[PDB]
Amino acid sequence: GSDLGKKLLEAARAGRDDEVRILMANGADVNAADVVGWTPLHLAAYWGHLEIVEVLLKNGADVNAYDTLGSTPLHLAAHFGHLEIVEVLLKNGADVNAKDDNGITPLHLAANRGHLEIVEVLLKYGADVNAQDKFGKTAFDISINNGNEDLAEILQ
Amino acid sequence: MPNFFIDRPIFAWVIAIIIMLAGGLAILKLPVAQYPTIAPPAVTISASYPGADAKTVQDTVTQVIEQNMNGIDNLMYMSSNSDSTGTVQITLTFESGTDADIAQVQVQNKLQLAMPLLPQEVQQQGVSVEKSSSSFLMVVGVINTDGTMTQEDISDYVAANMKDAISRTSGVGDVQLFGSQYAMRIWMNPNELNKFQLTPVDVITAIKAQNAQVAAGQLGGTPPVKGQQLNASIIAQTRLTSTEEFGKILLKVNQDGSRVLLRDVAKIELGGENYDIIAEFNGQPASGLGIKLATGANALDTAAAIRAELAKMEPFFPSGLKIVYPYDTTPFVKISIHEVVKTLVEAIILVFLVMYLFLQNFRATLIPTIAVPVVLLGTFAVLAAFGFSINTLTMFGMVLAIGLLVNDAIVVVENVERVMAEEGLPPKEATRKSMGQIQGALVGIAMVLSAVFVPMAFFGGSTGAIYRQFSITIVSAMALSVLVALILTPALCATMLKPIAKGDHGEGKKGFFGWFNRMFEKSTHHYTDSVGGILRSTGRYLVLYLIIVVGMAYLFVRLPSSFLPDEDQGVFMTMVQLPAGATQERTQKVLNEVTHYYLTKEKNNVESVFAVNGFGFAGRGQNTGIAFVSLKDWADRPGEENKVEAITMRATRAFSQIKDAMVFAFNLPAIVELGTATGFDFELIDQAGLGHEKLTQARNQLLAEAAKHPDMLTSVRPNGLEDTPQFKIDIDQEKAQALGVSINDINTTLGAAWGGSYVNDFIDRGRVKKVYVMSEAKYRMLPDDIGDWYVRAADGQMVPFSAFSSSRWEYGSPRLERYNGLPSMEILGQAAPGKSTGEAMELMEQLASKLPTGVGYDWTGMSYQERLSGNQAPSLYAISLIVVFLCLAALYESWSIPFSVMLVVPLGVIGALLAATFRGLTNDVYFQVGLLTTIGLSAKNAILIVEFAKDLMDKEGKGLIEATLDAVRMRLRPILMTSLAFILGVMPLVISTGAGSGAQNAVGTGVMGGMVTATVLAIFFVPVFFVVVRRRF
Amino acid sequence: PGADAKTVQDTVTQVIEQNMNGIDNLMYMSSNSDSTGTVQITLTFESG
């Protein structure tokens, strides 16, 4: 835990852009993580702060940092439907097929919440459409279980 | 009437004696307390849902109860919070004047009918309805010093052997245990369970079966076979009573005939019901009792009763156990009552000194000595009649009123003395003539003083309740004072005073007094010469008066406004706050460090630190804590350096560098019952379907905008908690159904093990107590423990929790708030220096109007009181003004002459403002009470001047200046005596340090500042006022 | 129903009695707990 590391976790969470800017100039650990293993990139992704995601990525943030249950920022961004953040992470090397401890992927999470554009973006970056979670489920299973016809059509 | 009693001194004695006996009786029967009821009645509903997160509590308990709070009368507003300690509190606040008993029973009856809608385990725990706007009389700490008892051990002892006897102690209305009685604690082991294909479900089932009360019936019960010889009750299964028995509960018979017992899969022990709070007292395990005074009780008698009871319990204490008193409001009542006595004693002495110094005979000296005590005693009798208590505020009014009774007493006797010396009339004839000169004005003065003080009783809510205490004490005192002036003191004067030869002004005596007399006689001529030359040039004095009036305006405006001044109440608090997710152990290290500081760096000021881990005021949880710091007496803490403000500021400084924690000392509110009463209290409301996240965004938006106006708003902040990481686990229904695992088993396994479960009751040495199952700590700490729990499937196979669930981190609220039934967020802040809170409120309303669609707001608490209180003030001040004028117009038979008296108001008010400003004080209720008494006194001096001046023109045909000069000459001595007596008598309030000195200093420096300028200015200005007013009309 | 007197006193009467402190004008309180499991607690108040 860093002095500035903690300050950065908070600023990124709060989306205080100007503060994050200053913190970057000062060398605040971009790889700082809280108790559950979340980085500022994790936090920015969760709460959907796009500029901070971009600033963190310019400053050497681990794009594929996983938390203590193995979830990545792409998981969070996909899950909470932040399309532009999803795109940015992918452009910066996010593992499109990252599995968390449950074998859950970003495609699973996006399909489960009915995020069609994000599902499309993920498929475009090579999301494995046949990937199965710990229960053998695919994003497609989720779609028809949820009764989402549009989504199902997308995944064939 | 004066004439009536001058001829009937015995009849006047009889009235005085009746008044004294009525006063004496009242003192016996009068409730004694630190404060009257001041806060509006508030009822609180408390529920607890073991192992529940905040959203669970809100959505299965809080919303249901809130939706049933209808048809209840005089409700102002309702507010609630639900948090992740499994707790909800709903507070309903009622209009001032509501019967608190009716309010409570109406709330509890609506609740009673919502119970069937609540979850089972919440019904099991019960839901309490209580009056919460009541405060603690004292707190009794119970500690163990020899390391033999845990705080659980102590709490159980107190509940079993102290609480009830204290509850029954005379005068106590309520007792609260700081902890719980023992519970039977079953600490499950998931490895041992799985080993035998058992689960918490089996553990709960076995316990409900083998720890129970079972009805049977009777032998030879009715209706019987005729000829039956005995009738006897059958006793069957009764509840378990020991850990040994619980350990021996049967869970399973193995195939080899071997037996699985509860002690084979769990650790059994007596322990707490909850483990959220860790209480220490100077580092040692602690418990205690919060005690409240019963209605109409005597706080001093109750305190002594409580200590007497504790003493007779002491012989039976186990070793190491010690009673300790970290909070006792009872000193303040004692100090207050003593002040009333000390003030009465000092006034009698001062009046003796001043009467003798000027009148130089012991007889005149006696009359006030008699009259003042009589009036004061009768004042208690009226307080009683009106249902007031002897309390800090009423007693403080008594001290002020004593100053007023002294004034009346002196004025009546002085005038008889002057009339004797000037006319040579015998005591009786002179008393008649003297009373004839002042009696009308005395009644007018009584009317005018009432008009000033009474309207303040009509401020609403809290503010009125505080002013009421003063205005009823003060207005009663001077109504009785005038009454004694028209009945007793004339009788006393006519019978007790020695004759004075006409022309005898004592200039012939030798020694100090002969000198003083010649000097004061010369001074009176120099004075009248001055006034003569002043009245030769009234133009410049009108100018000087507009200057004073202007300066008053300026001083008044720039004086900072506060409601009540802080006090050094002998105790203060230290907030401790650790980041989200911070654990109980970490908080304890900070508390320890904090406790180590006070016992070290404040060893000369600090008696004890009561560290409460797991408790905060704006949110409970493992990462918040409070240290209650108790001090030695104000006597052992000499000077400003060792008073609470100094100590706290030093403490907050020293704690600033504590690493990962927010730690700061701060003072109690002046009246704990009333709450903070500083700045504003603002509610942001989800008026549509926005939800928690969208309301947080709107909150943040408003907080950022508040921060852009540091010029008008300072410290605008949430009163609640921020979202924190939480661990979301999804049960997969399909996989459970496919494995033959029921959801009820899964969910009961998870919640019983990780959240703990209240199974049923047992009896421990004759007291009924709870039974809880829960996992031993080390099997419910981390996410990887989740997979160590197993559930038995229909087919008998044991299935690890990991087989049918998945988990992820997310954020959520550890404390959801609601206001008037809607999601809400409470925001506190204050006006920046130089600005009024009302102005700060208006901006908040303006920023609020720019928030996203569907976000509303409301004002509550102090801000609610502030608003409706602020809308009266103008109407009340005008009514006062009008009535004063009408009384004066009646008194003088004139629409214009009242103006010459009313003009004196700035003359005293300017002094008050000057003294306050210089001494750095503020305009608060005690200052305002001081402004009123300052106005009244200067009003009184002016009234008698104008009365004499006018009477001389009317009765003796004297010219305007002639009459004015003569009046002012005649009133010089009484004004000086009367002002000297009062300045000296109010001195101790000004220099007072210690108990209640904040309040004392406020009225003291105001009333003394005001008395200096009022008497110096009035003796020159009211002659001017009277002349110019007369001329103009 | 079914409780002996000592049981109902321990689980019922004492529980209620210990909450009957601090009621206005309470002169005295008496109760009984019997073998039919029924308890009666009577609170008597100042004459007016």
Ligand SMILES: CCCCCCCCCCCCO[C@@H]1O[C@H](CO)[C@@H](O[C@H]2O[C@H](CO)[C@@H](O)[C@H](O)[C@H]2O)[C@H](O)[C@H]1O
């Ligand atoms: C020596 C004898 C002493 C006698 C002193 C008697 C004083 C008694 C005065 C009490 C009168 C009621 O007191 C006051 O009445 C007025 C008129 O309805 C109320 O109503 C007031 O409220 C609104 C608030 O928006 C004002 O804008 C409005 O001008 C005014 O009517 C006040 O809210 C109430 O506090």
Ligand SMILES: CCCCCCCCCCCCO[C@@H]1O[C@H](CO)[C@@H](O[C@H]2O[C@H](CO)[C@@H](O)[C@H](O)[C@H]2O)[C@H](O)[C@H]1O
């Ligand atoms: C108990 C408090 C004791 C306070 C003692 C402190 C002294 C306070 C003095 C108050 C002022 C009185 O001072 C009084 O001023 C007026 C001026 O208006 C003087 O009056 C003199 O000058 C004015 C013009 O300047 C003339 O019109 C007037 O005819 C002339 O005699 C008086 O001679 C003087 O006595």
Ligand SMILES: CN(C)c1ccc(O)c2c1C[C@H]1C[C@H]3[C@H](N(C)C)C(O)=C(C(N)=O)C(=O)[C@@]3(O)C(O)=C1C2=O
């Ligand atoms: C807040 N306060 C004055 C104190 C101070 C010292 C303490 O030692 C304690 C408290 C609060 C009390 C409240 C009580 C309550 N009750 C009277 C049984 C209670 O319902 C709970 C609870 N969390 O459910 C407690 O924490 C509690 O058991 C507890 O352990 C406390 C406790 O230990």
